[PDB]
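User: quick one
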Amino acid sequence: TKGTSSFGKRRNKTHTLCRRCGSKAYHLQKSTCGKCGYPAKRKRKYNWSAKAKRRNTTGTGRMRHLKIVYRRFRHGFREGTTPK
Amino acid sequence: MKFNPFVTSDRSKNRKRHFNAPSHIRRKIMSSPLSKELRQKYNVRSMPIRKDDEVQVVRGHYKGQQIGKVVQVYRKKYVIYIERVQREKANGTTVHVGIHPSKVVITRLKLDKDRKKILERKAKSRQVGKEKGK
Amino acid sequence: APSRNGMVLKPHFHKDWQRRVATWFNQPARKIRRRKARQAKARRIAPRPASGPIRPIVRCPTVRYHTKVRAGRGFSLEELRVAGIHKKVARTIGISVDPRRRN
Amino acid sequence: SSHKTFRIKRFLAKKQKQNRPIPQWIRMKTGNKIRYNSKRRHWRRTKLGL
Amino acid sequence: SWWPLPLLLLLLLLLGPAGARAQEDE
Amino acid sequence: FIVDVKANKHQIKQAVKKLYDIDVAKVNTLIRPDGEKKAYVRLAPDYDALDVANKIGI
Amino acid sequence: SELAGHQTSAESWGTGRAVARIPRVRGGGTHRSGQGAFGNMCRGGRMFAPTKTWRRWHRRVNTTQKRYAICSALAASALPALVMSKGHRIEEVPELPLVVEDKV
Amino acid sequence: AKIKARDLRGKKKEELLKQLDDLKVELSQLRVAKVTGGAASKLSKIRVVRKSIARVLTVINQTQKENLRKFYKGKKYKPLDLRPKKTRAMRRRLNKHEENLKTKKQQRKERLYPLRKYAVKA
Amino acid sequence: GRKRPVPKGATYGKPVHHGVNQLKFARSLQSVAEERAGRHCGALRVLNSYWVGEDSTYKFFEVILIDPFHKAIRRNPDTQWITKPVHKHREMRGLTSAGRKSRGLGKGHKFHHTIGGSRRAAWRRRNTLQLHRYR
RNA sequence: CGACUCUUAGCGGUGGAUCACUCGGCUCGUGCGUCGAUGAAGAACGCAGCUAGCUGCGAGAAUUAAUGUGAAUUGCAGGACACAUUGAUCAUCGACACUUCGAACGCACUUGCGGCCCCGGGUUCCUCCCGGGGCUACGCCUGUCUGAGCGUCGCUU
RNA sequence: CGCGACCUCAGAUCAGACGUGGCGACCCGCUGAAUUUAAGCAUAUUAGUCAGCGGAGGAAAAGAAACUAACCAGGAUUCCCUCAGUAACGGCGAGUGAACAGGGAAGAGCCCAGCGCCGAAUCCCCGCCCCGCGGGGCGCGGGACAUGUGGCGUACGGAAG
RNA sequence: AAGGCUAAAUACCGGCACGAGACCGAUAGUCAACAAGUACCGUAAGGGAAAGUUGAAAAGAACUUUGAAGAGAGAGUUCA
RNA sequence: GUGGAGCCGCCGCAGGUGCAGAUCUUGGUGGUAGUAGCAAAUAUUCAAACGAGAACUUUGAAGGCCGAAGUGGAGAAGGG
Ligand SMILES: O=C(c1ccc(-n2nnc3cccnc32)cc1)N(c1ncccc1Cl)[C@@H]1CCCNC1
Ligand SMILES: [Mg+2]
Ligand SMILES: [Mg+2]
Ligand SMILES: [Mg+2]
Ligand SMILES: [Mg+2]
Ligand SMILES: [Mg+2]
Ligand SMILES: [Mg+2]
Ligand SMILES: [Mg+2]
Ligand SMILES: [Mg+2]
Ligand SMILES: [Mg+2]
Ligand SMILES: [Zn+2]
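Assistant: Done. Structure below.
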């Protein structure tokens, strides 16, 4: 009753995936995510989990715009076109 | 002795830039010496090899006395192919064995607009060095 | 835990002292750094004397040190009165000025 | 479920397209070391979790 | 083909407790 | 056809009409389970689906 | 060693369960699921007494011994028994404190 | 039959769009040739016609946007995608003019008592 | 003062920290006024504030704010220090007149619990182990 | 005698220690010290002739332009060799472009339902009619427009 | 009744700007333990540290005495060596613990309100032009701010006439 | 005193680019030398691996023969 | 003898300095052992066909079970 027969009544899901971090941690009744806390404005990170930071620091993604800022830095942020 | 504090000396960091080089650095590093008739005439020590230069191999299983044009330049495998040196497979289909361009002597170049300018610039950079010897 | 005749010691290591440790490995590299900052400054003020203005004669306060003479902060604004040079012209000619000093 | 929302089946389509072997021209490439797709998912053993 | 695939970690979890109980004389 | 999934049946009805110079009776659409939208464009009774197929390539 | 090598959850099983009382990693699934974590015995664990970068690397010698050692090293460069018994083939060489003129 | 970018910059707007809408027809009837059995010589043409179709769109956008910067030249209040995008913390610095402002109490303090050059030997 | 925000007044530690209901919050009430005036208006730079009233339950402070991007503040170099990006949010760092009175800083023999910079920069520097290279 | 067992050895298995190698760490030091409403970090999905991952990208999608460089890319095909055209490839990177979510911005998050303005075709339309575009978050500052008050008055009635 | 001036306030998809969120090694403001040590344990210690919360910046904070001193006196801040495991705190137990002299690294000083004087001599926004690039300045003209006090000289080392 | 500003000397286990070492050498060194915060596990918070080396060059064993094939017997490539 | 690119003696220096044990850690291999086992819900049989090869596939024939609160016909959640 306690074990392998009450596992059969697992039929309806507590969490769905989150819009902001893509997790399966968005709780369908609390309406909040368990990783980022989506309807809060800030990102949910804590210093008591050092590993859970490095899953989602800056650098663990594409960096679609900080790739370019680091490349535009080393020439001083030009705005004219070029010399031919 | 190396004196510049902005160039390496370690085996691990020179082997990394050698195998992961861009393909325009990689033609500078697949260079080849010239012959004695051709460096007495163009006074330049060596050139990067290209598609139609004719070559005699100087080391290996195939050595000397066979001038032959090169036919393909694998930069990915750091290897040139020469029109005469080949190898029979088990199938009977002969294919080119590939050799390294520092094991290679250019005996006649291929001259276009740009290969003239590079030889001219690599030559002028030597008699400036002969003028330091006052 | 103690033993025979020795000192009775109070080592101050009962605290997380390994996160606050200072290693002077950069201390060669900061000595050649602050030499270069002296050299690149000495030619920036090129005719002016290095180590800046003239400092005053100052006797050290205590019973321990009042026999000796020390460089000071600046001139008291009555020396510049008596020597006859203006206090807003003194520091631009190379004279350190300390307005809170009494003689 | 046969009642699904559009985010679920544009998620289940992405997991269905990358459940696919390597092409056999790709082990002939120079210097590689992949030899079979190790990220293959069977629909009974490993389940996606929504 | 040929090259197959890896299986799964054993992931054993302990269970039983000194068989069928049993208490010594008091 | 196979159609981009941001299109609806009003846009497909004008895209097929203006690229292929033929009338469209009705359209049915289907997100096929490998991700893409499949369109079933039924031509008008004036036109034939066969010769339009032979001039678009197949 | 870079930091703790303890960046790993591990508590002992403690009780019976017939395995040694080293801490075990948590969870399941993966191979690293009941393996013995940190301690200087374990594959993947932490080494005994990890080296610290504040070991005393540099030594003092007071100046009148540094000068003693460098007066003792020039005077031995002027004896042909000592300078040949270090390896330098000075057999064909002239007068043993070799000086040359300042033109060099 | 190669499409060069500098070949297209001296052309009119209605000539580019005719030659853009041309390339969209040959890009589509090559996808018909792919989705049928196959005509493998015409499946390497599907890359030199979709990289040629980016060249026409770039020349259209660069004769549209650099013509649009001539229009707001010398105007107050130009649009946001014509202003320089140099790293938001730089758009909130003052400017070279306001950073070089001096008050009148500090203008006469610099001209009455200016910094002299000197040395001390004789 | 502050009540210690703890459920049913039970703090669970050693008895010296049972202090629910006699605790005083070492930052002043004027600095709380400067803060949430500057917390609501984030585009504004707070200069300082003063006192205008109190009754029994409430205390009233007029907080004076500076708009850094107005061209009467962006010009006039007597005021251009506060339109410079290190002066963002001077109360969340305690840099106003009401803020720095809680930091306990000052010159003198009464104030060298903060003898380099601040209270926790004096703390780090007396509690670091400065084992040198030749030691 | 033949098996079974035991101990040595030769050979073969099973296994992956050892040694040799190292495009990885680790530590120290140096220079710099730069994100975002002009849409960041992060997430989702899509992009190759044959492509699943990784890596690179964004419907211009395994990259366009520009400048440097000067004949390759390469697992296999295909197609431009022209380079006294603009020239393959690679690097650089300042010009253009940059789907959806996200501070995330019309409201919702169920790809749900809008509201104004302009442009194309239908009623040549104002009145909930297809497509395209633009605008529409909150706080807050200076100004402008509208105007609330048995708030303080002034002239009038 | 109405009209008007203000004063306190509201609305706008008003003209133009700004704030939000990320990283957080170092820095600032808060808040805050218990393991542990005391051979037990309460004050103490751990420790004003870990964890929590908020703000930055290439540095930050501090900073030109409501200082130290006590003698022939020194002279902003920060940092280093020393002072010093010292004076002092502590079931005076376990333990905790600065500063001023002194020698160096670096060195730099200044501003306002007030007080009065000056016909508000000051500033913002828009309109067109002298002249301009890669745009911001003096000028020409109204609409505002502002006397409930803008700007000039002025700062305790004195200042003004 | 109860208002304000201020460079340098100082800090830097995150970022961008570097140079080095009496360091480790694939059970070591980062968890990760490899499609690694990946495979996998948990409703979630979170947990988290294993896995380097043919050869100088694929020259990666044509062809013959046994068997339905896997697998052999020859032959061949190679210093091997 | 295998192996195919590095290695050692002496004088000093410096350590992550020598294993049989820790219900040690990780990996590998035994004996037990061709053993325990492949026993809940009545049941299989004949011929044929395709095939290298048939107790199990298919097809026909016989004999049975479920027996309409089904071992039948469709769904929801879940799966993908
Ligand atoms: O299933 C078990 C059961 C029996 C023995 C073990 N053991 N014994 N030594 C052991 C060593 C290691 C692991 N497990 C072990 C575990 C469980 N039961 C059980 N029987 C008797 C007393 C208590 C219980 Cl709970 C059920 C109860 C319901 C009816 N069917 C039997
Ligand atoms: Mg919100
Ligand atoms: Mg290295
Ligand atoms: Mg508790
Ligand atoms: Mg000593
Ligand atoms: Mg053997
Ligand atoms: Mg910054
Ligand atoms: Mg390009
Ligand atoms: Mg619209
Ligand atoms: Mg191994
Ligand atoms: Zn989330």
